[PDB]
Amino acid sequence: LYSLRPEHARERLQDDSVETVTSIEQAKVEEKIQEVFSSYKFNHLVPRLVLQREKHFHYLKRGLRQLTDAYECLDASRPWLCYWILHSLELLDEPIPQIVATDVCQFLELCQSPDGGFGGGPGQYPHLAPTYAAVNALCIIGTEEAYNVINREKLLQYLYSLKQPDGSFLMHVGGEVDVRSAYCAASVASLTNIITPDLFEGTAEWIARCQNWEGGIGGVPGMEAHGGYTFCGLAALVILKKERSLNLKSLLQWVTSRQMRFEGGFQGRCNKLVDGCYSFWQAGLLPLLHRALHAQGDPALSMSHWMFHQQALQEYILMCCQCPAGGLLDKPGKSRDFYHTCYCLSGLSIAQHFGSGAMLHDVVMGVPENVLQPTHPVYNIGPDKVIQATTHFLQKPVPGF
Amino acid sequence: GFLSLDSPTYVLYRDRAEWADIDPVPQNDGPSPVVQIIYSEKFRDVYDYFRAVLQRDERSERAFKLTRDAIELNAANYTVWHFRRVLLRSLQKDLQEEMNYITAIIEEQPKNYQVWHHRRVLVEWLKDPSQELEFIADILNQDAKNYHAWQHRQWVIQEFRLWDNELQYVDQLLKEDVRNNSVWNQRHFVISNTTGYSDRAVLEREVQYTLEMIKLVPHNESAWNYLKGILQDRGLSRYPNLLNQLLDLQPSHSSPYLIAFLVDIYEDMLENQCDNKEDILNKALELCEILAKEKDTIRKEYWRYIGRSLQSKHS
Ligand SMILES: COC(=O)N1CCC(CN([C@H]2Cc3cc(C#N)ccc3N(Cc3cncn3C)C2)S(=O)(=O)c2ccccn2)CC1
Numbered sequence: 001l002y003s004l005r006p007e008h009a010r011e012r013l014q015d016d017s018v019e020t021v022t023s024i025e026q027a028k029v030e031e032k033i034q035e036v037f038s039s040y041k042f043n044h045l046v047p048r049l050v051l052q053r054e055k056h057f058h059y060l061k062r063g064l065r066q067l068t069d070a071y072e073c074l075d076a077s078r079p080w081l082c083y084w085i086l087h088s089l090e091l092l093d094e095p096i097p098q099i100v101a102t103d104v105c106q107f108l109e110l111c112q113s114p115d116g117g118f119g120g121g122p123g124q125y126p127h128l129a130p131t132y133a134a135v136n137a138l139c140i141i142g143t144e145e146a147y148n149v150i151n152r153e154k155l156l157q158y159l160y161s162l163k164q165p166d167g168s169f170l171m172h173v174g175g176e177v178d179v180r181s182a183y184c185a186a187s188v189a190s191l192t193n194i195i196t197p198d199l200f201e202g203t204a205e206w207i208a209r210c211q212n213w214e215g216g217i218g219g220v221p222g223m224e225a226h227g228g229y230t231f232c233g234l235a236a237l238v239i240l241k242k243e244r245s246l247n248l249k250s251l252l253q254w255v256t257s258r259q260m261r262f263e264g265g266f267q268g269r270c271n272k273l274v275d276g277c278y279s280f281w282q283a284g285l286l287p288l289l290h291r292a293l294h295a296q297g298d299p300a301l302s303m304s305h306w307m308f309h310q311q312a313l314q315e316y317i318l319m320c321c322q323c324p325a326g327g328l329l330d331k332p333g334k335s336r337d338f339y340h341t342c343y344c345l346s347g348l349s350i351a352q353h354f355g356s357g358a359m360l361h362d363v364v365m366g367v368p369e370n371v372l373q374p375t376h377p378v379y380n381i382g383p384d385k386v387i388q389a390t391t392h393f394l395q396k397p398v399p400g401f
Numbered sequence: 402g403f404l405s406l407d408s409p410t411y412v413l414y415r416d417r418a419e420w421a422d423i424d425p426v427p428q429n430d431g432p433s434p435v436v437q438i439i440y441s442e443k444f445r446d447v448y449d450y451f452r453a454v455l456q457r458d459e460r461s462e463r464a465f466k467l468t469r470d471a472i473e474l475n476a477a478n479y480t481v482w483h484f485r486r487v488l489l490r491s492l493q494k495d496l497q498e499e500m501n502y503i504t505a506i507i508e509e510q511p512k513n514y515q516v517w518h519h520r521r522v523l524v525e526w527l528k529d530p531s532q533e534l535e536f537i538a539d540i541l542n543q544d545a546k547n548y549h550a551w552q553h554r555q556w557v558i559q560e561f562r563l564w565d566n567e568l569q570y571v572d573q574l575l576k577e578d579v580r581n582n583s584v585w586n587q588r589h590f591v592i593s594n595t596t597g598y599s600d601r602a603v604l605e606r607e608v609q610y611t612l613e614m615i616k617l618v619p620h621n622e623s624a625w626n627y628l629k630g631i632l633q634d635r636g637l638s639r640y641p642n643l644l645n646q647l648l649d650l651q652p653s654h655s656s657p658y659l660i661a662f663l664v665d666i667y668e669d670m671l672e673n674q675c676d677n678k679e680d681i682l683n684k685a686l687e688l689c690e691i692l693a694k695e696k697d698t699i700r701k702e703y704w705r706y707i708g709r710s711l712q713s714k715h716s
């Protein structure tokens with residue numbers, strides 16, 4: 001294990017004897033991660049990296065049905081709960097009883113707005129975020145019933161009502177604008193085959209304006225680069241086939257720098273803390289970049305690994321992000337939740353599976369039962385689900401209005 | 402008459418007389434619910450009534466006070482926020498009093514999107530940004546990296562042209578925490594939108610300042626990224642002296658950030674027909690392996706890519 005090697009203590013933070021809130025908080029996290037890493041040594045047991053599948057499963061399958069009031073804060077994001085849970089189960093290779101699938105389809109039907117798009121719950125106004133989650137959930141289910149839930153004509157109408165002259169999209173009527181909305185739109189529009197010639201006019205250019213001096217992408221032009229927005233930005237550009245619009249090299253250097261030499265996981269922005277969910281948002285950028293550079297015929301690309309330490313990431317996730325009682329989390333000391341369970345798992349899958357053209361290569365740390373089903377780097381749902389959904393919706397013509 | 406949602410004498414809406422005329426509307430989760438939240442009774446009560454006033458579109462003072470409770474129970478419910486803004490205009494509510502309210506709610510939940518967007522809408526309606534820089538400064542004094550706070554600050558500054566004192570504010574926060582990446586970002590935001598970096602005196606100032614910060618805290622990546630960020634435009638190889646001056650900190654301030662920056666300078670030298678191509682390449686390749694095998698192994702795959710990429714290009 002890379003994280004337990006003697007020379008690894010050598011990666012601890014060096015504050016140059018100048019303490020600031022930033023170094024102080026980083027040091028606190030490292031101290032706690034080191035305790036986790038050393039737990040084996042001090043207890044005298046052989047390190048055993050095991051993904052608590054069964055534990056995660058009971059947690060997930062129960063949350064899919066009901067949740068405690070601790071989730072009242074997500075009462076406006078229920079389609080997200082569906083997606084996070086169904087996707088985690090998908091990654092864990094757990095099946096979706098046809099009866100549960102139909103129940104999810106029916107609930108999402110209640111969340112869908114007569115004007116197109118999905119709301120955070122029955123009767124709530126539509127919003128691009130839950131719209132993105134609803135469509136992704138329905139695609140994971142992948143049945144004709146799931147596909148039919150989506151009112152394609154109204155969805156297109158809805159996207160147009162959010163489209164701005166400068167190329168951006170509002171998250172919802174009378175709402176805010178940021179890179180996430182471009183990704184949500186490009187994601188649902190492409191999966192359901194409703195992309196018109198002018199729907200995304202100027203969008204690639206608007207997203208490019210969000211790439212800053214750091215190499216990464218901010219929420220809106222001028223803002224600090226952040227893993228969440230960078231993933232949304234690049235993924236949306238890949239969908240639109242406009243990745244060239246970005247300086248891919250400054251972006252590649254920025255994201256690889258986001259992996260923590262000591263913890264092994266990724267931070268969301270320069271100088272802040274590691275967090276398990278970035279195992280997807282940040283690490284997920286490497287596959288997208290590999291594909292983009294490969295498209296430009298880059299000859300120096302690897303043929304077996306992504307450009308980030310796959311082993312270190314898996315170690316951070318397996319040793320530090322699992323809740324004994326099931327479920328995954330941000331960092332040691334934090335509470336488990338379905339969001340982190342979804343993305344810690346998504347990131348683990350990405351870290352386990354490499355692929356570029358005819359080359360395939362897996363890296364599974366710990367027991368082989370640790371291997372998860374692969375996930376598509378653009379949509380973050382099974383690759384099979386992407387092909388099946390796109391193949392399905394291509395049967396239908398783009399709405400003409 | 403605001404009966405605080407936390408007040409000891411708070412009473413459910415179903416027990417309130419001034420609400421006796423209306424029937425609460427339960428949420429339709431379907432016969433076979435999924436991700437069903439077992440709401441507390443206070444929550445259920447408030448939202449069952451919010452739904453009643455929403456469906457009939459009752460734009461009354463009581464519905465208004467009610468949205469306040471629904472918002473406090475779940476500040477991320479954007480549907481509720483939308484209705485509250487509808488009521489603010491229909492009822493012709495004093496927007497300055499609403500500003501006091503949003504100020505308080507943001508203080509309590511600074512990491513919520515809705516509260517910041519609401520504030521922006523109020524500032525737009527009133528066309529009054531006189532309170533913004535100070536309010537945001539208070540939030541940043543509690544969390545100097547709050548993303549929404551910084552985004553609101555940039556919006557205010559750019560919308561109302563309030564550039565004059567921001568660079569000074571940046572210097573202040575950099576002194577407090579020279580590692581605050583949000584502040585280095587703000588620095589570039591202010592400069593690129595005012596003087597720009599084409600001004601040689603300005604660029605000189607900025608590079609010198611950054612180099613000084615690097616000397617003070619050699620392992621602070623933000624300072625390094627800013628130095629690279631403002632020079633990468635024209636091209637690192639455009640500044641001959643820089644290489645030498647960094648090559649001097651080789652013993653004193655020799656972090657993996659300096660090594661990486663050296664490789665970056667080499668990369669650009671080769672791309673711009675530099676002297677000693679055979680020599681520069683070997684140095685670069687040398688550092689790439691030192692980084693990959695010793696100094697920055699977490700990023701080995703990246704550095705191998707770079708060396709291997711540097712070869713195919715400048716063999
Ligand atoms: C209509 O709106 C929606 O439905 N939306 C979907 C969710 C979205 C907010 N987001 C939140 C999702 C989220 C869900 C659960 C659960 N169960 C737990 C925490 C959490 N956080 C907190 C968190 C995660 N990592 C660290 N922290 C503190 C952020 S986010 O994914 O965009 C984001 C924000 C900040 C940091 C990291 N990630 C807002 C829009």
Ligand SMILES: CC(C)=CCC/C(C)=C/CC/C(C)=C/COP(=O)(O)OP(=O)(O)O
Nearest residue numbers: 129180228229232268269272273275281548
């Ligand atoms: C499709 C979709 C909705 C994608 C979401 C992308 C995403 C994760 C965006 C995060 C934006 C944000 C406000 C981060 C800062 O929070 P923080 O400061 O609490 O976290 P940090 O300290 O790690 O930056």
Ligand SMILES: [Zn+2]
Nearest residue numbers: 275276277330
């Ligand atoms: Zn997280």
